[PDB]
């Protein structure tokens, strides 16, 4: 059931590697992950990892005003985050086109991928014994994770792809 | 031979895997690679990396550049970012090039390495480099590193990407300054 969340991160991760498998070199390998060189990226990562990644966060989320995995990466710039992560928490939370919860969550998700701290975010949401005892019940994914294992296995292939996709994407 | 230039780059590696080595989490780890926080990191790239592969750049290079100014000038391995330079890569070199006020080629080479390793771009960077025939011709000896590199199985180019593989896994935050 939660190794269910786990197969659309899986399958999204898989379309991705797979766009990327177009290109002979490096070189081209940076074109394809340009969103405004090839837009359909963008799409895919919008499309597919960012609701896959979103229903994971989501999951379990205590719902109380109302909580959101936007307020989980909130709560995650830490004593329990990197100076980096909370740099890209800023720009994101100042993207004054962004109107939604949602629509921040997804532009965060970009970011990591630009700056391949994919696998390190999430890392970082398991460190944190208060966000997670806080912000989520006991039958949640992350506090069930193992699954943070297998998790992090299934983002490590998108932390050596070279990303540059438009944070304002969407 | 270009073993040796090799050898200096997996030590390098050796010594800077080591140092992220003392963490236990992905986390810690990232930790180790903020200069702010871990000044050794910074020490340790500048004095063990940098050097390698600056030695890797220059070797074959042609030692002039012409130039409107004074007919020609000393090529360097800055000289070959500046003639090479994705977006990314674009906006780095940017970065490094106004905050160069009198700092020396080799600084400013320093300062790209420390920002290619923040953005775990060095193997696309290489990889720009032998793609570029042009530039090639234009600036290095046909025995130079990067020249040769494009042949051979594996090739030269194969054994560096694969001596900085190990890297790949870390996560680097460097003052490009901290020099």
């Given amino acids: 059931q939660k190794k269910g969340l786990l197969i659309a991160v899986s399958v999204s991760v898989d379309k991705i590697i797979s766009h990327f498998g177009a290109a002979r070199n490096l070189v081209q390998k940076a074109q394809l992950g340009d969103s405004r060189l090839s837009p359909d990226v963008g799409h895919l990562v919008l499309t597919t ?47 004054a086109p962004l109107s939604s919860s949602r629509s921040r969550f997804h532009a965060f998700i970009l970011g990591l991928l630009n700056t391949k701290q994919l696998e390190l975010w999430f890392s970082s949401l398991q460190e944190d014994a208060g966000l997670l005892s806080l912000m989520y019940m006991p039958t949640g994914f992350f506090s069930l994770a193992s699954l943070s294992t297998e998790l992090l296995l299934l983002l490590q292939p998108l932390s050596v792809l070279t990303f540059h996709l438009d944070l304002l994407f969407e």
């Fill in 49 to 95: 990892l960012c609701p896959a990644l979103h229903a994971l966060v989501a999951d379990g989320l205590k719902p109380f005003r109302r909580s959101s995995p936007w307020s989980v990466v909130e709560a995650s710039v830490k004593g329990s985050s990197t100076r980096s992560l909370g740099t890209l928490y800023s720009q994101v939370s100042r993207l």
